[PDB]
């Protein structure tokens, strides 16, 4: 049993709710929340400015000490940093973004960071605005993961459309 209240089921691991995800990691505290992080760390805009935001530019901080010691994420890659007062830790994991030219193959290789955690709350990754479907991100998402993972989608409209379009 885990903390993750009015999920709504999808399959055996993945569950999903119309939900604000810097809301519901203020309330959950997950061990692990993941950011919609780009290769850079550089949370100006989206989930990652959000996120960011919530934490006071804290996130940021931290975010910039690490590119420093280590250079660039890889598109489809992620990091492992603190998830300051919203999570235990905030799994970055860039997904790509269709808007910049990246290539959507890789989608898969992103989620696949998922599942080296036991339980994660996360937002579709590539979507919103790097730019892919929604739909094929929870495709992929349901396909790729199998750990438990809660997904937070923001956009009420898009959530109702998400459930009801679900294979
Ligand atoms: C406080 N907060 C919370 C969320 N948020 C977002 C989420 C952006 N959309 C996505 O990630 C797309 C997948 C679809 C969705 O989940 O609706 N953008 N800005 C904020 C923000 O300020």
């Given at each position: 049993?885990?903390?993750?209240?009015?999920?709504?089921?999808?399959?055996?691991?993945?569950?999903?709710?119309?939900?604000?995800?810097?809301?519901?990691?203020?309330?959950?505290?997950?061990?692990?929340?993941?950011?919609?992080?780009?290769?850079?760390?550089?949370?100006?805009?989206?989930?990652?400015?959000?996120?960011?935001?919530?934490?006071?530019?804290?996130?940021?901080?931290?975010?910039?000490?690490?590119?420093?010691?280590?250079?660039?994420?890889?598109?489809?890659?992620?990091?492992?940093?603190?998830?300051?007062?919203?999570?235990?830790?905030?799994?970055?994991?860039?997904?790509?973004?269709?808007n910049k030219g990246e290539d959507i193959q890789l989608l898969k290789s992103a989620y696949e960071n998922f599942n080296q955690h036991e339980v994660l709350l996360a937002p579709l990754l590539?979507?919103?605005?790097?730019?892919?479907?929604?739909?094929?991100?929870?495709?992929?998402?349901?396909?790729?993961?199998?750990?438990?993972?809660?997904?937070?989608?923001?956009?009420?409209?898009?959530?109702?459309?998400?459930?009801?379009?679900?294979?």
């Open positions: 049993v885990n903390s993750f209240s009015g999920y709504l089921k999808l399959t055996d691991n993945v569950y999903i709710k119309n939900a604000d995800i810097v809301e519901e990691a203020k309330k959950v505290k997950p061990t692990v929340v993941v950011n919609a992080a780009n290769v850079y760390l550089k949370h100006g805009g989206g989930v990652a400015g959000a996120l960011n935001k919530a934490t006071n530019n804290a996130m940021q901080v931290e975010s910039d000490d690490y590119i420093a010691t280590n250079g660039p994420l890889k598109v489809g890659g992620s990091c492992v940093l603190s998830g300051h007062n919203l999570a235990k830790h905030c799994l970055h994991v860039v997904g790509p973004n269709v590539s979507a919103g605005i790097f730019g892919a479907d929604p739909i094929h991100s929870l495709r992929v998402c349901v396909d790729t993961v199998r750990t438990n993972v809660y997904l937070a989608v923001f956009d009420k409209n898009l959530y109702d459309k998400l459930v009801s379009s679900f294979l």
